[PDB]
Design a protein around this ligand. Structure first.
Ligand SMILES: NC(=O)c1ccc[n+]([C@@H]2O[C@H](COP(=O)([O-])OP(=O)(O)OC[C@H]3O[C@@H](n4cnc5c(N)ncnc54)[C@H](OP(=O)(O)O)[C@@H]3O)[C@@H](O)[C@H]2O)c1
Ligand SMILES: NC(=O)c1ccc[n+]([C@@H]2O[C@H](COP(=O)([O-])OP(=O)(O)OC[C@H]3O[C@@H](n4cnc5c(N)ncnc54)[C@H](OP(=O)(O)O)[C@@H]3O)[C@@H](O)[C@H]2O)c1
Ligand SMILES: [Fe+3]
Ligand SMILES: [Fe+3]
Lengths: 400, 398
């Protein structure tokens, strides 16, 4: 048998990363050197003004002769109305690029605005298979929360509040030109956000790790990165201004979804993520919080379809020795327990979502499959494609 | 400590990897807007193993016109680069397509630069010209070792001066590199092994540079352990595709920037000493590293003891502490290299101990002519003087 095949792949990631303390003043230099004179400066709720990130950025833009217009108020699960608002500004002000300053919600919004600025229609079309994004304005970002790896990929997730649809799109045109990551600006993050961001980065790795593939080099890199994220999370809970922890976690989040973990694999599973979108769409919970609930339940539901990799998970992430269903369940339980330790919800009840809502959540998941996945030939899950009834059982596993 | 150093990461090269991918070469060239290329290659292995025919068929299919220059040598020489630069210019090629190993891809990089330079491209290797622009470079890689397929480096030997020098430039990053690991099945065992030693050595030049960030250590250690496992498999079964594929990607990430993140720029003493061995005796790059690296480790470990402890625990699974552990790990590394057939002394390579002073002279020249113009020095956790280089070579002699 041949369960460790390294799949054919194409790898291409042109994004420039500028990383470390004191790097944010380079943002104006990067934009100037990229030949850009006028940007839309997009941001969230003004944590960036409060922590001095805004003044570092503005001082750099002013120093390097960059003109800008601001749009603020991007929300943590970003919404389409705000993208619409910003697209109108970008078009009316003739901006040459979009500069997102904030967390994943801002950088995803920046991508969606960069695409929409070059599209005649409603950019929501791209999230429901009615428009393939081939071109976008250049995107620059100053990242202030490490979680999603959006700073170094072509993905964006937006919620249409009108329809309660939280959907993703992926395009080469949405890779940032330059992303600046100063991990020290993360010292002020709430503990819960730090942890949710770690859970997200781990989950991105696991979506690939569990896709049925098992190349040796990819397993090694995945495992090393998971172990690093876990260690750093624990440090950050105790000491939120531990720079090396922030820095290690930041880069691990970046590589989790920059193409690194995809190499040699089968494209990833993505069932947990797509299920979680419906929780965030319906309840506005943190992405990472939803994943802490769904992932362990999914793992318990599916492991017989990929047992050797669940055994390797137990051995390589947690150091257990053994074989079979016992070892598999030991590893899944340790994962659930670690999530609980660091304070993440591991049930719907932990998050205040009642059991009697399950069927409503399942309806939302199924709509996502029809409207977001089917148009691009995607399906829910890979090692096991999940039908309505499978989604219901997983949520019932995660209910209490 | 375990500080994660500030860094800039940028690697725009596209990789197309796997079985049956070489037919994409003409498509990639076409899609890049290019019609006429210089097809550069080595000593003829590609004509005996089907690669030449795959490339030519793809170029024909996609309307790509080409001129050829062959004869690139395993330690590539400046005279052949000169020949190819003249053909490039005379024939108005729009890109350079290197099909072969690292010697060929490095030569393609040098030719792509020299094609746009009025002078002798050797200037770039001695600090007299800054390569800011070069023709587009494409490559079909047939041996995994150097990672040249996904970086901006090139090393060329000026035969007239016995100087084997490196250059790095953003302009030398390939546009597209195609890696079909299955074409490596025909490699002699020695070349497979020298390739693996070079990949491991790239990782270690970063691993031992004084820095020790957790994420960078983990990625390095997992990559080295994989290379070692796959090398052993390939010595027994050269047509083990998964072993070739895993080794291929490991060698790519070893020097594409992945190992540099959060570190201090790398040590590079072993590489730069080795270049003198290859300049003077024409030995394989990786063979020389097998000789120099263990000696260098034995010489310098007191300057970075904690990382040498970690090397022993993480690569070999040894337990304990301090110098006993450090020495166990270094000896295990040397013995592994010996096990897989690499030379681990100058004697193993047919190099006389009496020649150490002539080798040292060449190393010192490299320092004056290649390193100092670019503000670089021989070593980092210990800068190496003439005497230190001599002591390292003595430790490597037998
Ligand atoms: N594109 C992708 O690769 C991808 C993949 C998976 C998930 N996602 C998406 O990304 C979004 C999640 O983004 P995220 O996890 O990065 O977090 P986020 O939603 O952007 O931010 C969460 C919270 O953190 C705060 N914050 C950010 N930086 C801070 C700082 N340094 N100090 C103190 N507070 C700070 C924000 O407040 P302020 O507004 O005041 O700054 C906000 O309330 C979700 O919509 C998810 O679906 C994208
Ligand atoms: N740029 C960088 O990142 C960097 C870094 C370190 C070292 N280097 C340099 O790279 C060079 C070494 O390159 P390399 O290790 O890749 O080896 P190479 O010198 O390009 O090739 C070594 C031998 O392998 C043969 N060969 C290649 N592919 C084959 C195949 N698939 N089947 C059978 N034989 C095959 C060649 O024969 P044919 O000629 O007949 O094809 C040649 O004799 C040195 O000059 C070294 O200094 C570069
Ligand atoms: Fe996510
Ligand atoms: Fe090398």
């Amino acid at each position: 048998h041949h369960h460790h095949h390294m799949e054919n792949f194409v790898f291409h990631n042109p994004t420039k990363i500028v990383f470390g303390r004191g790097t944010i003043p380079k943002i104006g230099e990067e934009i100037k050197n990229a030949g850009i004179r006028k940007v839309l400066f997009l941001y969230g709720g003004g944590s960036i003004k409060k922590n001095g990130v805004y003044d570092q950025v503005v001082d750099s833009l002013k120093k390097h002769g960059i003109e800008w217009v601001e749009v603020s108020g991007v929300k943590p699960n970003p919404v389409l109305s705000k993208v619409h608002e910003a697209v109108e500004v970008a078009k009316k002000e003739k901006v040459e690029a979009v500069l997102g300053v904030g967390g994943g919600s801002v950088v995803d919004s920046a991508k969606a605005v960069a695409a929409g600025a070059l599209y005649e229609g409603d950019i929501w079309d791209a999230f429901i298979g009615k428009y393939q994004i081939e071109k976008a304005l250049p995107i620059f970002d100053v990242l202030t929360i490490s979680a999603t790896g959006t700073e170094m990929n072509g993905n964006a997730v937006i919620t249409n509040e009108k329809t309660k649809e939280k959907y993703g799109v992926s395009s080469k045109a949405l890779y940032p030109k330059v992303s600046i990551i100063d991990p020290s600006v993360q010292f002020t993050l709430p503990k819960e956000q730090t942890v949710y961001g770690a859970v997200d980065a781990i989950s991105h790795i696991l979506e690939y790790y569990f896709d049925g593939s098992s190349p040796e080099i990819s397993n090694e890199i995945a495992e090393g990165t998971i172990r690093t994220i876990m260690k750093m999370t624990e440090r950050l809970i105790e000491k939120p201004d531990d720079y090396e922890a922030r820095a290690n976690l930041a880069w691990s989040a970046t590589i989790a979804l920059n193409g690194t973990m995809a190499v040699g694999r089968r494209g990833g599973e993505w069932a947990c993520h797509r299920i979680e979108h419906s929780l965030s769409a319906l309840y506005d919970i943190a992405h990472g919080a939803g994943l802490a609930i769904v992932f362990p339940a999914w793992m318990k539901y599916v492991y017989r379809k990929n047992p050797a990799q669940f055994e390797r998970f137990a051995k390589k992430i947690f150091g257990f020795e053994g074989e079979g269903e016992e070892l598999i369940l030991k590893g899944i339980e340790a994962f659930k327990n670690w999530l609980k330790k660091v304070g993440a919800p591991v049930s719907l009840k932990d998050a205040g979502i009642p059991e009697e809502d399950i069927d409503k959540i399942v309806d939302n998941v199924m709509l996502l499959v029809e409207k977001n996945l089917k148009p691009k030939g995607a399906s829910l899950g890979r090692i096991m494609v999940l039908e309505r009834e499978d989604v219901r059982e997983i949520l019932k596993l995660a209910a209490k």
